[PDB]
Ligand binder design. Structure first.
Ligand code: QBT
Ligand code: QBT
Ligand code: THM
Ligand code: THM
Ligand code: ZN
Ligand code: ZN
Ligand code: ZN
Ligand code: ZN
Lengths: 168, 168, 166, 166
């Protein structure tokens, strides 16, 4: 078929998963089979929760469209997406491009170069409430790169709020 | 404030309401007050169902962001949106731009010219399952312009399927 | 086969530059492109005051581009006819006149388009905000009045209102 | 105040045309624009082989545009420094090399950008699909190899694979 990789990035609170599911739903109206892969440690179509993509086995071959949510948590995501898109799947990934220090998730970088489409969504600055936000700020003490959570541990911020808060 | 009008259009099954709510949710993370107006005959923030916008009264003035779903059903929508955006509201509208005969909803036309932003979403062709779809085809006999329903009465189609089906 | 793409937005948003960006892409894949402008190897250009004056020349090309669509009175139908014959049709046009009222024909195109992008400009009054409207700066009440930055400026919503007052 | 906008995509997608479209918009609002290209009144232009060679000239302008960003080795840091000083920084760059591997510096920019658009081209092999990849057409294994359609073509995913076989 005509396989492809579509990538949705942006910081937290930007609605990336909502966009992902908007796209899935469109495909479902045309009767395409859709498989949604979520990340296992993360807290109505075919889906699975795994800690890596190799654990999906070959189950993905039964579907037209593969959606991968929270892509930054999967260590082998670029290769998975390329294998699937070479087999003719439409592969849709949502992921953080940047961690709380504004450093890239390397695997998502790889996907940018392999993607047919890349959209970067914004959020609204949760600090000043006046500007578009492109960064995620962690609000709890921790230095683990991976730290699963929501608005209890993070907020999205504009460029100048991210600086200000970093100083204080 | 800085008021604005954002317009989301496209045919049925394109996820316009999903996009609308994605945007609302972004504003809600920055603690903006959001009011969602739906159409009365149509079948977790502040909301109301009305048959026209004049029935909302001045209740809309209590919010930062006003979202209007199914805009093509409201006869006074352009004027409402302009009044609200002149008062400093962010106004977000989802609507069909075109009816099942591919003729414009005139009021949505007005909004295009008054909008700061206009996005037209596509669906996937529900007839051939191979192309982007920009049109809505009605699958039931009726000549009422307004005819409320879902996939039981409509389907979205690409340009050439719309023609083909029209011929048969 | 065919498609209609529409590019709208106020003056000074670069709609024609976007239209040509797209044409160029198609030229790199050896598609033939026919560009129609308004007036009162792979490419081909023409100035006309309406689309009937092009005749059937357009059928020789893969891609048809129409600039300043809001000055052509039969643009909707022309684009539909061409896209039904399998052409990629790309149109740049103002959606709104200086009174923020729609060009009716460009409305019809919105409903018939596969793609619609509305570009913005930068507010020429405050220099601080995205602009979506075109303010006329010279007294007149002719709808059509050809000109440039001497006669028009692109403005944000609130500068449009302000200027309208004073 | 400041911002970084990034425009990516393969060759023949019109990234530089989009970058200039944006610059032009800012010029209509009387913003000063400084355009930096690569080499081995309101405007100002410069060719350089790295961004250190610009010195502090860039501070005199509202908008800084950087073309062919993937040839500059210190682009990420440069753009961050400029956006922290309140500049609007606009960068066009290849995200991927002819082997579909990323330019590492353009990666860093993706994470630091307020806006990222990836443009497509039209497949120069099949002439039927959107193209997101750049295929090199001449044998070589130098990463950097300056050239045009003689040496490169933009292709869709499946034409990239096909050609890679034969
Ligand atoms: C910014 C982040 C986020 N995260 C986590 C927090 C959330 O569980 C998840 C992102 O949620 P998202 O799906 O993109 O809405 O990633 C990290 O582990 N490290 C970081 O640096
Ligand atoms: C195309 C349509 C649709 N409709 C209705 C069917 C649906 O109730 C509604 C559109 O649903 P939507 O919200 O855009 O997902 O509009 C008409 O009344 N007339 C038409 O010509
Ligand atoms: C906004 C507007 C522009 N124009 C013109 C100015 C330019 O000649 C052209 C826009 O490129 O259209 C009008 O004729 N009427 C209008 O209402
Ligand atoms: C894809 C690719 C392009 N280029 C060049 C070709 C052009 O000179 C320039 C793109 O405008 O970069 C490389 O040097 N290496 C690459 O891998
Ligand atoms: Zn902020
Ligand atoms: Zn179809
Ligand atoms: Zn202004
Ligand atoms: Zn191809």
């Amino acid at each position: 078929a005509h396989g492809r990789i579509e990538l949705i990035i942006g910081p937290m609170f930007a609605g990336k998963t909502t966009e992902l599911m908007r796209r899935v739903q469109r495909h479902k109206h045309a009767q395409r089979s859709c498989y949604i892969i979520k990340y296992t440690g993360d807290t109505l179509t075919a889906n699975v929760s795994v800690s890596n993509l190799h654990d999906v086995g070959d189950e993905w071959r039964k579907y037209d469209v593969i959606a991968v949510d929270e892509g930054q948590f999967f260590p082998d995501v670029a290769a998975f997406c390329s294998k699937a898109a070479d087999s003719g799947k439409v592969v849709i990934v949502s992921a953080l491009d940047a961690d709380y220090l504004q450093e890239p998730f390397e695997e998502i970088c790889l996907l940018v170069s392999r993607a047919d489409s890349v959209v970067k969504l914004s959020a609204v600055c949760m600090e000043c409430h006046n500007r578009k936000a492109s960064f995620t700020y962690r609000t709890v003490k921790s230095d683990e790169r991976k730290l699963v959570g929501g608005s209890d541990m993070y907020m999205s911020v504009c460029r100048s709020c991210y600086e200000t808060k970093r100083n204080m």
